[PDB]
């Protein structure tokens with residue numbers, strides 16, 4: 001039926017998007033781990049700068065920086081980036097999340113020190129190759145705007161969008177940047193994830209909403225699809 | 241209509257797959273360029289090995305090797321790889337293509353020196369940082385079998401298959417590897433690319449063929465579709 005067709009298509013769209021999203025995030029983590037491994041091999045300042053200032057790194061991340069435990073100094077790849085004169089990398093979420101985990105992690109969303117923009121960072125600790133002593137942490141900042149734009153390149157009957165959330169409904173990435181880091185209830189009017197496709201009313205209008213898990217993080221992708229438009233589009237695909 | 245649906249589907253297969261193929265290939269080129277730039281920064285052999293032997297590089301490409309202009313020595317990332325005593329990288333197509341171009345290129349298909357398998361390589365020149373002098377070339381081998389599998393992940397409901405050709409009709413990747421590096425006429429019976437959906441007769445039977453360009457290489461994604469199968473499957477979808 002039309003309803004079963006709409007429901008099955010919505011299931012398929014969000015399942016597909018969760019696969020693409022996992023690949024995007026894994027690609028970012030793989031680049032970050034590669035750069036980190038090269039830094040661990042030789043963490044001399046000149047080498048660090050070479051590694052993090054190449055086009056691949058500049059294009060993949062908003063900003064990359066290596067903060068040192070010994071003195072709270074840092075080397076980063078943006079001479080203009082200014083978090084203020086008292087900034088200490090050692091007290092930042094990316095630094096402590098990497099130190100505490102002892103391995104690559106992605107932070108929860110947080111506010112950038114310089115811009116106030118909500119982002120997440122891939123974060124990695126750096127160990128002495130001989131002794132295993134913790135030397136500091138590296139962050140690789142991920143634009144949530146670019147992430148939302150990327151995940152929304154899928155065909156969604158020309159009226160609908162894809163978003164990403166944590167297990168607890170915190171918005172990781174939404175086409176409207178204002179929602180990043182905010183509870184998904186601000187745009188959905190539901191606060192708990194219901195994975196299975198279901199109806200959500202926004203401003204008197206019905207939408208189909210569905211979620212799918214993202215492999216490698218506790219995240220989920222969600223879709224919000226105009227029900228009127230989807231039904232009409234598929235009815236045209238059926239009757240005529 | 242059913243007719244419009246089938247014709248639109250053929251167009252959408254090649255358009256969508258040419259976009260995803262561009263993304264994948266561009267990602268792999270960007271990794272090759274990054275490794276190349278780090279090698280140019282410090283081409284000492286142990287540093288080169290460190291750069292090319294990390295899992296990111298080993299998982300992205302079949303094999304990576306840097307051939308030197310001075311003596312035809314090489315540094316590669318497979319200790320199980322031995323090219324024989326007289327193998328000279330300076331006479332190989334990846335080497336000459338990179339030297340001629342003076343920039344990152346992807347080779348036409350050629351036979352691997354060790355395995356004989358038809359493949360392509362991402363290939364880059366390496367310059368001396370101080371003098372600008374050509375030091376040699378690096379290859380990053382790409383599996384055509386893997387590429388064929390990748391472009392065929394798209395839903396085709398057993399109606400056909402997807403393939404890749406270059407501008408001159410040379411097969412880059414076909415599900416049946418025997419066609420790789422051979423003229424596409426061996427499986428299509430036509431040699432000239434017509435991008436617009438058109439009918440071809442293969443063994444007395446008509447098929448729909450269409451192409452879409454890949455941004456970044458002189459490549460096209462092609463599809464062959466049995467409309468007898470497509471029409472039946474899309475009619476089933478229409479009434480589901």
Ligand SMILES: [Mg+2]
Pocket residue numbers: 015018019212213214215
């Ligand atoms: Mg999933």
Ligand SMILES: [Mg+2]
Pocket residue numbers: 453454455456457458459
């Ligand atoms: Mg092209």
